[PDB]
Amino acid sequence: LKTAKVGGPACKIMGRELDLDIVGNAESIAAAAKEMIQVTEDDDTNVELLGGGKRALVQVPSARFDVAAEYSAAPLVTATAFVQAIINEFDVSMYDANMVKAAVLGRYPQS
Amino acid sequence: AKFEDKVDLYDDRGNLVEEQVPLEALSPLRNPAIKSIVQGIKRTVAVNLEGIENALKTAKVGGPACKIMGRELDLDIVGNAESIAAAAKEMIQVTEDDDTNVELLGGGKRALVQVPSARFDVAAEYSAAPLVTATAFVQAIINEFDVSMYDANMVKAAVLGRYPQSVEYMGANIATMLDIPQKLEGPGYALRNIMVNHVVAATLKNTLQAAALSTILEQTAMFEMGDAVGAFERMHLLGLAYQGMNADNLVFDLVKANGKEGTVGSVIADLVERALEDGVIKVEKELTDYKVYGTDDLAMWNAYAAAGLMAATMVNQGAARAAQGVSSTLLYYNDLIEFETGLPSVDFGKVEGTAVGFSFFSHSIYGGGGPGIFNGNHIVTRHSKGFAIPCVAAAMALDAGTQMFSPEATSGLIKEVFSQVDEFREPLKYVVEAAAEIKNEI
Amino acid sequence: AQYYPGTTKVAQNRRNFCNPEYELEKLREISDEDVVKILGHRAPGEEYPSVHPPLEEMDEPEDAIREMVEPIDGAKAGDRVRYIQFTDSMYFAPAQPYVRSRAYLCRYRGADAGTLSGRQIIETRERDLEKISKELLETEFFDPARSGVRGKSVHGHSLRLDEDGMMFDMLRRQIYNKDTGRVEMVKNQIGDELDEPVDLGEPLDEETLMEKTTIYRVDGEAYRDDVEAVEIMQRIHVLRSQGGFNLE
Amino acid sequence: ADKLFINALKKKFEESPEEKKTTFYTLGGWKQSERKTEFVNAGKEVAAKRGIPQYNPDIGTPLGQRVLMPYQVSTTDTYVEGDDLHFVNNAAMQQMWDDIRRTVIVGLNHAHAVIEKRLGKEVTPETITHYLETVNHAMPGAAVVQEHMVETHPALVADSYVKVFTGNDEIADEIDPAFVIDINKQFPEDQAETLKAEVGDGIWQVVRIPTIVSRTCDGATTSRWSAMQIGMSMISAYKQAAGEAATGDFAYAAKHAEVIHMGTYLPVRRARGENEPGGVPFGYLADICQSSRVNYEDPVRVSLDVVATGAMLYDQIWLGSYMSGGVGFTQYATAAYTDNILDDFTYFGKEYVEDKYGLCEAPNNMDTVLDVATEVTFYGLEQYEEYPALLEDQFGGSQRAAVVAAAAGCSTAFATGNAQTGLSGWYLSMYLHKEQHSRLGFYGYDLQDQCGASNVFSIRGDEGLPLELRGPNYPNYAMNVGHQGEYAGISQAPHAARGDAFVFNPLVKIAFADDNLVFDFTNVRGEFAKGALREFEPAGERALITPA
Amino acid sequence: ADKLFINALKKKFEESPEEKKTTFYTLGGWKQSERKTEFVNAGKEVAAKRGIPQYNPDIGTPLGQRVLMPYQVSTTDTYVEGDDLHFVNNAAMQQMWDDIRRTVIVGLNHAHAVIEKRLGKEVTPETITHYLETVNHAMPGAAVVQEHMVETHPALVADSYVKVFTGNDEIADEIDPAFVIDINKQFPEDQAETLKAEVGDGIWQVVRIPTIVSRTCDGATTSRWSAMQIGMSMISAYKQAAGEAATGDFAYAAKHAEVIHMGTYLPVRRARGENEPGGVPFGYLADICQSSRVNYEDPVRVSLDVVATGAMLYDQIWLGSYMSGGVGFTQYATAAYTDNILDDFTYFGKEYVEDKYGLCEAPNNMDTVLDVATEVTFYGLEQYEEYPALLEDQFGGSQRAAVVAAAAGCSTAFATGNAQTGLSGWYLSMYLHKEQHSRLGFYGYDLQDQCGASNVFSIRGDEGLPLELRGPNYPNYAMNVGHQGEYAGISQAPHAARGDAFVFNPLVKIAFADDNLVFDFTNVRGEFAKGALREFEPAGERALITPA
Ligand code: F43
Ligand SMILES: C[C@@H](OP(=O)(O)O)[C@H](NC(=O)CCCCCCS)C(=O)O
Ligand SMILES: [Cl-]
Ligand SMILES: [Cl-]
Ligand SMILES: [K+]
Ligand SMILES: [Mg+2]
Ligand SMILES: [Mg+2]
Ligand SMILES: [Mg+2]
Ligand SMILES: [Mg+2]
Ligand SMILES: [Mg+2]
Ligand SMILES: [Mg+2]
Ligand SMILES: [Mg+2]
Ligand SMILES: [Mg+2]
Ligand SMILES: [Mg+2]
Ligand SMILES: [Mg+2]
Ligand SMILES: [Mg+2]
Ligand SMILES: [Mg+2]
Ligand SMILES: [Mg+2]
Ligand SMILES: [Mg+2]
Ligand code: NA
Ligand code: NA
Ligand code: NA
């Protein structure tokens, strides 16, 4: 986000930079994401910060897969929960939020 | 609990079943009948024993018009179907009293197979259903007739086709409602790649049941895709309830009031009246002889509008008893309602956009086809997030015979096998009953 | 119902076309036989072909939706689905493409309407199509100079008029008669010659075209000057935009 | 001054552009046209030679009941019948695609690390030069290690070669300059400094495989062919064992870890490998076009050269052939690069923005979108109303929708400096246009249009993406003419207004700054005109190996 | 009599073929070769013209320390250096692939039902002829309905057309014969009766889109282009509404329900659409080759014409370019179609079988596999031992493995009448060869070889398949030279011995029985020779639209 380097190797969109203190607010972001990822309170959802907030371990609740055809709910539910949690943490505008989406999930669905 | 909304649930005759059910009792994530339906569709396979036998006898294997002269094998498969199916079942099951089902149909010409749910619990996806079923029947046929090492590869070709030279099971004599994982337009799309004709076939052209099955599959995919996570979840649940489950009898009552003489426009007028009476919308501003409507609940407005969209399809394509105009209804219901109200149409323009391309690709040279060959994974009709395809299912259910590529043409094997399954055939019944059962656990 | 915002003659005409309680002005008389000839799907006196048996002859299972929705007469009979298609000049034809599709799904049952820039189509059961087509041809939906019945080779909506005030037609289906000041349809909508032409009446004069038109133009009523109509379009854009982002 | 399309309208018709009436049916049908006449005669000859009927003007309906128009290629003085702008009939258009399809960018950063760390040998400008002489022998299809190899004819593959670039000037200047894309030579000073800072000390190859191969095969061939000959050249130039474990690191690096494809592969319904048009994102298409480095003082010219590039590739070759075929989609595309019409509308919008806000100084919000896109949309539509000849020229509603909305969207992005609000303006233009004229495009034109407003700022999985990252495989965009090339223009617009050296990938920008290409990417519309006139010389022909 | 390869060995070397010793290093390197000399001179001109070094004989190791050999194209008297058999340098080879890539087979059975059932109109030989006149105008890219269409130049697209065939003699004989592939004329009586019985009253179009388009685009274009112009021609010829609901039924039928692609699409790692070489199953390749209908009294000739077809397509163009590139794999393939070597070995095996069992009369079992495949393998290997010139000719172990095993496998299938036991014999040949000479092929040659025996008769998901249905995407086969074309030959072998009209798809067989093709599929090896000599005239060139 800070560099607007999104969408794959060597890609960059000049003018789209957003400077958000994500790692410094990792606890709040992770908790907000967890509330979206879980099905019910105290189910088998895990969202654990690692490396001083630089990384998160996410285990999407098993119940989502019991009513899914396959396994893509894990990255897709996780991605949108963190995109939404970041937008909401910093009140990212309608105009800029698509950069958060690109920073999390990349060039999909063009790729 | 997460949402305060409650809905009244009805049967396909418009009779109340249960009042004031919490919305999340209808969630794919909570409702045990939706789970059962989805796991059922992952695990169920139609086996055409007659088709396998005929492919072998003629050596017509590997796809359309293909044949290998000299490879013919004449095996009495249908005459020994009971033994073959029992042998296949022993290989397909995990344990002897699990939820494996293998049931002969049509005098042994067809088999219904439901691969045990436990295989999917330790699988990444759903391909174990055709692959386990295929090899169990290949092996059972070889063993029944002591087919030699030299010939057995023809049995494999007759069952599963040109795979793996082809990516698909090209020429296979088994069928599933799902299609292979490689054909997904995006991750999470598998429950969308289910032909409309297959849904109509499974539900025996019962209009409300077809709409319900299609909505359940579409909106369950929206959870797998992550679209119904967070901000959007309530919108998707309300859409499932009001457009596909006839919540509050709104679809049913709009059809009743407009069925005799009504049009898309008359349905719109009634829906706007009902939204206003129920407090979903309110006049925000007066222009010159024109009221601008607003809403404090966009997700509920969207759901009301979606119910009206379904009713408009039922009224318009029901009156023609011809499905083709569903592309038009999906377009102009939404176009009209925006200029009637000043509010956004269903799925914020995405149904209207889907309908523009669907109209084009069902009346042009470039691709597509008739309504029944579309699905939520089709490039033409993937764009609305669950609010378009169920109307196409309803319209095809109402078609009296105007389509070349009808469910009778595309989905006969699916029909025979999948309509046997009560929860596939009458899903509205089972999902409503399950919602009522868990209503106080939400 | 409201149908359409705006305070211009154009806006009022758009509402009138949509409003099934608005009586369309009848401008010309056309015989049943001549409507059939113009459509070109069957010969006068030919029985309606069928695409499936009459609904009565079918043995359909219980379906509350079917029971509540009355089939149109041609659906009961099993008629083929057939079409009528019109092209409307941008030089002030009374009807225009989205005006038609919007109006058709307010006024007509069992309708498959499609809009394109150069052509607009309705498909429905054949006998019902014939009844609707009479209205589409006899009333102010149609002007025989600035509108055309065309199932193919539709070019002309955007072309300059000819010296008689007639829209271009590659296939010349409608011919202006200087001696009568009337237009004759000399071919059916797909372009096959009629044994006997059909009188379509006089073209509307300029004053009347301006009274009746549903296109906005700088040399008529400009859309940008119908500020309430523009306001609603802009509102829909903004509300769709916000909704797709966060449902606010 | 006159509106920019007036000269073209006067060329096409005998009437003045404002005249409302004409006469039809008197031109002799196809006989009015030099080109149709050529085609009639050619069809007779073809049918006589092969014994099967072919082109016949009496099949179907009779073309030319109206004037069959010439088109001015915008920014040129060339007027041609539209058939000369069909990609089949235009060797410049074909070569433009071949030059993209046959290119990949391949890093040397992992390879040089393999050399220094795993092989324990030094890399210098001298060793890089030796490697480049080697790979320029090998890449076109010639041998460097084995005995009894048989090779490609050098003259059939003369268009294949390898160059390099790097942001380190002193390193670039030490490599033999025959092999170097010189960033300081090709780009104006401020753009050069941006691009060099992006690349830094990285060293990248631009590999072009032979046109004749690309035509025989497909786009997914390019990175493989590239990697084989890089691999052989690493073996030869750095005196390696000819096939040891380290050989696989060079392969993985050249095929996967440091390759940039022009296009990504497509899903099964439209199955294609890499380096096909549908995989090329809009920001890459804008960066391939080289107008940005020549015409930088004129952001309209830069943006509309990108529109031309994309309208041709995406509508004529991609949608009109790969995804359909036949007569195809020439004029759906030509509307965006002929008669100076889009140019007139877009200069109007740029001047409106300059005067009211200043370029890139408007608030990046919906108020600006509503203001600019509405104003420009009404201007464009007014021109069709004021000039009946203009409306008869751009006779298809889709053509008009694309042109008007491209001007509106580019103008909105000129104001905000942001492509996403530009995109919102494109959709607003469509909605206004539809209400003004009670029509828009062909039956299926506004699928993406109606999904459009809601998906501009969405963040959901298969909905949300900055415009620069979108492309022909963005779901809503996957089917329909009259959008994709215009979106590439909108992607370019804010970057041209900002003076940015690139839109989405600096490596892609540098990789086409190369006069050894067959097509001249600095002047796409001039090249289309040259091809129309049958004056373009493509690569890939088989004349040397066939009878005289 | 002399072994069939003796003439070729005598042409290559001054020594008699039996001689064990020679002298090297005295030929002047590349200077011994007319072709290398041409290449050196061309490289100097290219480098000077473009300002970048290119072909240079001093780069890497010095070719031609041994004799750089001529090759006899088998069944011809044409001797050429191997560079003239590189697909890049051989227009016949390129056109062979274009003619397959640009072909689709498209039924009329749904289309005619839509006409009769949904529209309620009649279909007769007269209306079909009118439709065929229409579609032969439209298919190359010309208009039939709209005004102001711009079109392809008929002379650029002269190779595009539509024919039909049907098993109904009465219909076939009344349709205008310009448009009909006449099964009774093209096939001997027995084969014609088989084919007509397979097709029955079905009517099928053979659609060939323009070479120039296929080269610009890809294989997945073909069925789309076909369907667009079929759809326009249905509208025009049967006087339909130009875009109503029924139009979509013609589209779905032509694009999906009644189309036969030459190749199916590929998985992502090797992503490609339809009508690419990897999707063409071995049985289709055998059926495309038309040797079966000309040389039917000689099953060896038929089988080895199929091997030539497939070795070139699959090893040179597919594996050697689509899947790799560079100098590529000319001689991995030429081993199977030059110097009459495979011919010698395979005639030996056919005689062995004929004498011992009778063709097709051996038990279809492992005893027959062990007998025949062993005997033929030992014959082939003995020839390399007895003729040092032969071993120096087919210098790469892979080449020898492929040739010996092809003879062994074809011979086994000649005995059993079944391709699967033929395939088992191929793998046994490899195992024996490996033990005899303590070598087999290149580093990765016997991946499929070692999986081979176990997967011949497997029935598991991605293992079990009759050989005719296998192809380049069968998992074990997806990577390596020296197998795929030979498998196509083994697929042909039992069918040739049985006298069968086709191997896997009768529609594909009939679809290439057409002298309006550019390449002559009845004489594949003759055509490769003609291309090598620079005497073949391809389609798709652009000379007409480029300067003099
Ligand atoms: C048969 C269809 C339905 C369909 O699926 N495709 C068609 C026809 C197809 C054919 C026409 C070729 C021919 O005449 O043989 C081709 C060229 C595609 C092909 N198969 O190569 C095409 N359209 Ni169409 N098509 C076009 C257009 C259009 C415009 C033309 C309106 C007008 O007033 O003339 C309208 C849609 C609309 O009303 O907006 C249109 C309709 C239609 N389009 C109607 C025929 C209309 C008629 O009967 O006259 N196209 C255009 O608006 C401009 C570009 C133009 C395309 C050729 C090019 O780009 O050069 C062509 C693109
Ligand atoms: C829809 C889809 O066709 P099918 O429904 O899969 O036959 C798709 N064609 C297209 O999107 C055609 C796009 C180009 C022609 C229309 C341009 S407006 C394709 O061939 O994959
Ligand atoms: Cl909500
Ligand atoms: Cl060297
Ligand atoms: K190609
Ligand atoms: Mg059980
Ligand atoms: Mg046994
Ligand atoms: Mg009032
Ligand atoms: Mg009357
Ligand atoms: Mg000026
Ligand atoms: Mg003039
Ligand atoms: Mg003739
Ligand atoms: Mg130079
Ligand atoms: Mg990767
Ligand atoms: Mg130059
Ligand atoms: Mg000699
Ligand atoms: Mg003749
Ligand atoms: Mg299929
Ligand atoms: Mg010949
Ligand atoms: Na004709
Ligand atoms: Na014509
Ligand atoms: Na050398």
List Cβ neighbours of D541 (8 Å cut-off, separation of 6 or more). D212, E541, E542, E543
Instruction: Return the number of other C-beta atoms located less than 10 Å from residue D148's C-beta.
Output: 17
Both tokens of residue C60?
A: 């359909």
Chain-centroid distance, C-alpha B121: 22
Nearest to E115 by CA among E101, E99, E91, E131: E131
Rounded to whole angstroms, how far apart are CA atoms D356 and D333?
Answer: 31
Both tokens of residue E23?
A: 């002298």
Given an 8 Å threshold on Cβ–Cβ distance, is A70 in contact with B39? Answer: no
| Type of residue numbered E477 | Y
Beta strand E70-72 with E79-81 is antiparallel
CATH ID of A1-111, from 3.40.47.10, 3.30.70.470, 3.40.50.620, 3.30.450.20: 3.30.70.470
Beta strand B290-294 with B101-105 is unpaired
Rounded to whole angstroms, how far apart are CA atoms B358 and E14?
Answer: 73
Instruction: Return the number of other C-beta atoms located less than 10 Å from residue E542's C-beta.
Output: 23
* C-alpha torsion sign, points D74, D80, D83, D89: negative
Compare all CA atoms of chain C with the CA of A88 and give the residue at the minimum distance. Answer: C246
Rounded to whole angstroms, how far apart are CA atoms D31 and D9?
Answer: 22
Nearest to B343 by CA among D327, C21, D295, C239: C239
Contact D426, D486 (CB under 8 A): yes
| Type of residue numbered D289 | C
Which chains border E (3 or more CB–CB pairs < 8 Å)? B, C, D
Rounded to whole angstroms, how far apart are CA atoms B78 and D17?
Answer: 77
Beta strand segments in B171-245, E: 174-175
Nearest to B418 by CA among B218, B195, B176, B102: B176
Q: Please compute, for residue B44, the number of CA atoms within 13 A of its CA located in the half-sphere on the CB side.
A: 22
3-class state of residue E514 by DSSP: coil
CA dihedral angle for residue E442, residue E445, residue E450, residue E454, rounded to 10 degrees: -170
Paired strand residues for E80: E71
Paired strand residues for D104: D207
User: DSSP assignment of B246-297, as one string?
Assistant: -GGGHHHHHHHHHTTT--HHHHHHHHHHHHHHTTS-EEEEEETTEEEEE-S-
Given an 8 Å threshold on Cβ–Cβ distance, is C162 in contact with D61? Answer: no
User: DSSP assignment of E438-460, as one string?
Assistant: T--SSTTTTHHHHHHHHHHS--S
Q: Which of B12, B291, B324 sits opposite C112 (nearest CB)?
A: B324
C-alpha dist (Å) from residue D241 to D142, D236, D247, D282: 19, 9, 9, 43
Beta strand D21-22 with C161-162 is parallel
Best probe residue, ligand 2, of D269, D332, D476, D477 (max atoms within 8 Å of C-beta): D269
Given an 8 Å threshold on Cβ–Cβ distance, is B265 in contact with C78? Answer: no
Q: Which long-range contacts (CB under 8 A, 24 or more apart) does B97-106 make?
A: B103/B420, B105/B416, B105/B417, B105/B420, B106/B50, B106/B416
* C-alpha torsion sign, points E275, E311, E419, E189: positive
Chain-centroid distance, C-alpha D370: 29
Rounded to whole angstroms, how far apart are CA atoms E185 and E196?
Answer: 12
Rounded to whole angstroms, how far apart are CA atoms E526 and E520?
Answer: 9
Lookup result for tokens 């609901």: E245
Paired strand residues for B114: B44, B101
List Cβ neighbours of B206 (8 Å cut-off, separation of 6 or more). B12, B397, B426, C61, C63
List Cβ neighbours of E253 (8 Å cut-off, separation of 6 or more). E107, E110, E111, E114
Both tokens of residue E151?
A: 């079109």
Rounded to whole angstroms, how far apart are CA atoms D473 and A108?
Answer: 10
Nearest to E328 by CA among D211, D136, D213, D238: D213
Planar angle of CA B397, B398, B404, nearest 5 degrees? 75
Rounded to whole angstroms, how far apart are CA atoms E293 and E368?
Answer: 28
What secondary structure letter does DSSP report for D30? Answer: G
Q: Which helix (H) or strand (E) holds B22?
A: strand B16-22
Rounded to whole angstroms, how far apart are CA atoms D492 and D308?
Answer: 12
Contact D115, E180 (CB under 8 A): no
Contact A29, A86 (CB under 8 A): yes
Q: Omega of the bond prior to B164 within 30 degrees of 0, cis?
A: yes
C-alpha dist (Å) from residue C106 to B262, B332, C126, E499: 9, 9, 19, 68
Paired strand residues for D259: D106
Rounded to whole angstroms, how far apart are CA atoms D449 and B164?
Answer: 40
B366 is catalytic: yes
Both tokens of residue A60?
A: 């999407």
Q: What resolution, expressed in A, was reported for this entry?
A: 1.2
Instruction: Return the number of other C-beta atoms located less than 10 Å from residue E190's C-beta.
Output: 12
List Cβ neighbours of B140 (8 Å cut-off, separation of 6 or more). B84, B85, B87, B88, B91
What is the whole-number distance in angstroms between the Cα of residue D520 and the centre of ligand 15? 5
Among B residues 192-211, those touching chain E with beta carbons less than 8 Å apart:
none
| Shortest alpha-carbon distance between residue B96 and chain E (Å) | 24
List Cβ neighbours of A13 (8 Å cut-off, separation of 6 or more). A4, A6, A7, A99, D283, D419, D466, D468, D503, D504
Contact B415, B46 (CB under 8 A): no
List Cβ neighbours of C68 (8 Å cut-off, separation of 6 or more). B255, B256, B259, B260
Fold annotation for B44-190: Alpha-Beta Plaits (3.30.70)
User: DSSP assignment of B94-115, as one string?
Assistant: SSTTSS-EEEEEGGGTEEEEE-
Rounded to whole angstroms, how far apart are CA atoms B397 and B392?
Answer: 9
Contact D473, D279 (CB under 8 A): yes
| Type of residue numbered D162 | V
List residues of E with catalytic annotation.
146, 332, 444, 480
Given an 8 Å threshold on Cβ–Cβ distance, is B62 in contact with E503? Answer: no
List Cβ neighbours of D506 (8 Å cut-off, separation of 6 or more). A10, A12, D194, D195, D198, D199, D287
Buried b (16+ CB within 10 A) or exposed e, B206-216: bbbbbbbbbbb
Instruction: Return the number of other C-beta atoms located less than 10 Å from residue E364's C-beta.
Output: 20
Both tokens of residue E487?
A: 């498998």
Paired strand residues for A33: none
Rounded to whole angstroms, how far apart are CA atoms B38 and A5?
Answer: 40
C224 marked as binding residue: no
Paired strand residues for B283: B293
Residues of D whose CB is below 8 A from E268: 265
C-alpha dist (Å) from residue E342 to D142, D403, E13, E376: 28, 63, 20, 11
List residues of D with catalytic annotation.
146, 332, 444, 480
Q: Omega of the bond prior to B22 within 30 degrees of 0, cis?
A: no
Rounded to whole angstroms, how far apart are CA atoms E295 and E284?
Answer: 18
Lookup result for tokens 């395979």: E346
Rounded to whole angstroms, how far apart are CA atoms B204 and B201?
Answer: 5
User: DSSP assignment of C51-115, as one string?
Assistant: SS--GGGS-PPP-HHHHHSPPPHHHHHTBPEEEEEEEE-TTT-SS-HHHHHHHHHHH-SS-EEEE
What secondary structure letter does DSSP report for C217? Answer: -
Contact B303, B243 (CB under 8 A): yes
Ligand 2 proximal residues by C-beta, below 6 Å: B 361, 366-368, 379-380; D 269-270, 319, 323-324, 444, 479-481; E 224, 255
Q: How many residues does chain B have?
A: 442
What is the whole-number distance in angstroms between the Cα of residue D30 and the centre of ligand 11? 20
Both tokens of residue E125?
A: 């030989």
Planar angle of CA D420, D426, D427, nearest 5 degrees? 100
Rounded to whole angstroms, how far apart are CA atoms C118 and C122?
Answer: 14
Give the 3-state secondary structure percentages of chain C, helix then strand then coil, rounded to 5: 35, 20, 50
Rounded to whole angstroms, how far apart are CA atoms E219 and E215?
Answer: 9
User: DSSP assignment of B229-246, as one string?
Assistant: SGGGHHHHHHHIIIIIS-
Contact C154, C119 (CB under 8 A): yes
Nearest to B346 by CA among B381, B306, B382: B306
Rounded to whole angstroms, how far apart are CA atoms E511 and E287?
Answer: 9
Fold annotation for B1-43+191-442: Methyl-coenzyme M Reductase; Chain B, domain 2 (1.20.840)
Say how many CB pairs under 8 Å bridge A and D. Answer: 104
Buried b (16+ CB within 10 A) or exposed e, B415-434: bbbbbbbebbbbbbbbbbeb
Q: Which helix (H) or strand (E) holds A57?
A: strand A55-59
Both tokens of residue E456?
A: 């011949």
Question: Phi first, then psi: what are they for C187, rounded to 5°?
Answer: -135, 160
Q: Please compute, for residue B203, the number of CA atoms within 13 A of its CA located in the half-sphere on the CB side.
A: 30
Helix axes E299-310, E397-416, angle to 10 degrees: 140
| Type of residue numbered E524 | V
Rounded to whole angstroms, how far apart are CA atoms C234 and D430?
Answer: 11
Contact E506, E429 (CB under 8 A): no
Contact E490, E39 (CB under 8 A): no
Best probe residue, ligand 1, of C96, C116, C121 (max atoms within 8 Å of C-beta): C116
List Cβ neighbours of D512 (8 Å cut-off, separation of 6 or more). D103, D287, D288, D289, D290, D521
Q: Does E457 touch chain B if contact means CB atoms closer than 8 Å? A: yes
C-alpha dist (Å) from residue D251 to D225, D258, E442, E479: 11, 10, 18, 15
C-alpha dist (Å) from residue E403 to B3, E291, E300, E383: 73, 20, 14, 12
Both tokens of residue D393?
A: 């020229």
Paired strand residues for D260: D105
C-alpha dist (Å) from residue D164 to B3, D122, D132, D515: 59, 19, 9, 14
Residues of D whose CB is below 8 A from E59: 133-134, 137-138, 144, 236
Please give all residues whose CB falls under 5 A of ion ligand 3, grouped by chain where several chains appear: B 234, 299
Nearest to C120 by CA among C90, C150, C143: C150
Q: Which helix (H) or strand (E) holds B217?
A: helix B207-224
Structural gaps in chain D: residues followed by a C–N separation over 2.5 Å? none
List Cβ neighbours of B273 (8 Å cut-off, separation of 6 or more). none
Best probe residue, ligand 2, of E217, E223, E250, E255 (max atoms within 8 Å of C-beta): E255
Q: Specify the residue with its C-alpha closest to ligand 1, atom 27.
A: D396
Domains and CATH numbers, chain C: 1-248 (3.90.320.20)
With 0-12 CB in 10 A as exposed, 13-18 as middle and 19+ as buried, what is E31? exposed
3-state secondary structure D238-279: CCCCCCCCCHHHHHHHHHHHCEECCCCCECHHHCECCCCHHH
Buried b (16+ CB within 10 A) or exposed e, D507-519: bbbbbbbbeebbb
Given an 8 Å threshold on Cβ–Cβ distance, is D463 in contact with C241? Answer: no
Rounded to whole angstroms, how far apart are CA atoms C221 and E436?
Answer: 94
Domains and CATH numbers, chain E: 2-100 (3.90.390.10), 101-275 (3.30.70.470), 276-535 (1.20.840.10)
Q: Tell me the domain boundaries of chain A.
A: 1-111
Nearest to D257 by CA among D402, D107, D481: D107
Lookup result for tokens 């689509």: E322
Approach to solving: X-ray
Give the 3-state secondary structure percentages of chain E, helix then strand then coil, rounded to 5: 55, 5, 40
Nearest to D202 by CA among D125, D109, D124: D109
List Cβ neighbours of D159 (8 Å cut-off, separation of 6 or more). D102, D208, D210, D211, D518, D539, D540
**Longest alpha-carbon distance in chain D:** 81
Lookup result for tokens 């380049």: E472
Buried b (16+ CB within 10 A) or exposed e, D454-469: bbbbbbbbbbbbbbbb
Q: Is C139 in the pocket of ligand 1 (CB under 6 A)?
A: no
